[PDB]
């Protein structure tokens, strides 16, 4: 059944260092969120929102592809949360090609890195929504940050952050390919 929520819900829960701002009962963003502890893995899982951003010119802009992907582990890397659909759609958006490694002695790490290789060899960059460290109440703000999906996992990425309900990932070649009104933050 649906989770315990109010109308004009107002709470912040912290889950292994991620600050999570709770949306009210009727929000489609709270309805489409599936995130909990899962006994079957003895860890926390997320639903997450992915946006693939296509290669535009400086006059001709092109339109985004969106996908929400589910039951992604706090231990997972982005390429293991994205879904084969989002991986295959990135391969068709930028015309990336597939490769192989670690065949000398792996059967699970070889294919974890198979996906990540396509993104680092194309030079694709990944970004997420950030909100302030002291935030206790729900807000909307266009603020992105660039992150190292080839070195960092999703749990340590979100451990330093604030997010509303369930987190969002933007995929693009540059800031100049990212959607309008959104901006990426740099160091001081």
From Swiss-Prot:
Keywords: Metal-binding, Nucleus, Phosphoprotein, Ribosome biogenesis, Zinc, Zinc-finger. GO terms for molecular function: snoRNA binding; zinc ion binding. GO terms for biological process: box C/D snoRNP assembly; maturation of LSU-rRNA from tricistronic rRNA transcript (SSU-rRNA, 5.8S rRNA, LSU-rRNA); ribosome biogenesis; sno(s)RNA metabolic process; snoRNA localization. The keyword Acyltransferase does not apply. Its main location: nucleus. Transmembrane segments: none annotated. GO terms for cellular component: cytoplasm; nucleus; pre-snoRNP complex. The keyword GTP-binding does not apply. It is found in: Nucleus. Required for box C/D snoRNAs accumulation involved in snoRNA processing, snoRNA transport to the nucleolus and ribosome biogenesis. Present with 2800 molecules/cell in log phase SD medium. Belongs to the BCD1 family. This is Box C/D snoRNA protein 1. The chain holds residues 120 to 303 of 366 of the full protein.
């Amino acid at each position: 059944g649906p989770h315990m929520r109010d109308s004009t819900e107002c709470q912040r829960i912290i889950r292994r260092g991620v600050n999570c701002l709770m949306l009210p009962k009727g929000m489609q963003r709270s309805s489409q969120n599936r995130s909990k502890w899962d006994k079957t893995m003895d860890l926390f899982v997320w639903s997450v929102e992915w946006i693939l951003c296509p290669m535009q010119e400086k006059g001709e802009k092109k339109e985004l592809f969106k996908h929400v992907s589910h039951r992604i582990k706090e231990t997972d890397f982005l390429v293991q949360g994205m879904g084969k659909n989002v991986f295959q759609k990135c391969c068709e958006f930028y015309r990336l090609a597939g490769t192989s490694s670690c065949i000398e002695g792996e059967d699970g790490s070889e294919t974890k890195e198979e996906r990540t290789q396509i993104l680092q060899k194309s030079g694709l960059k990944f970004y997420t929504k950030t909100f302030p460290y002291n935030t206790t109440h729900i807000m909307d703000s266009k603020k992105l940050v660039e992150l190292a999906i080839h070195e960092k996992c999703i749990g340590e990425l979100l451990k330093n952050t604030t997010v509303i309900e369930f987190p969002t990932i933007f995929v693009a070649m540059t800031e100049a390919d990212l959607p309008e009104g959104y901006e990426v933050l740099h160091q001081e």
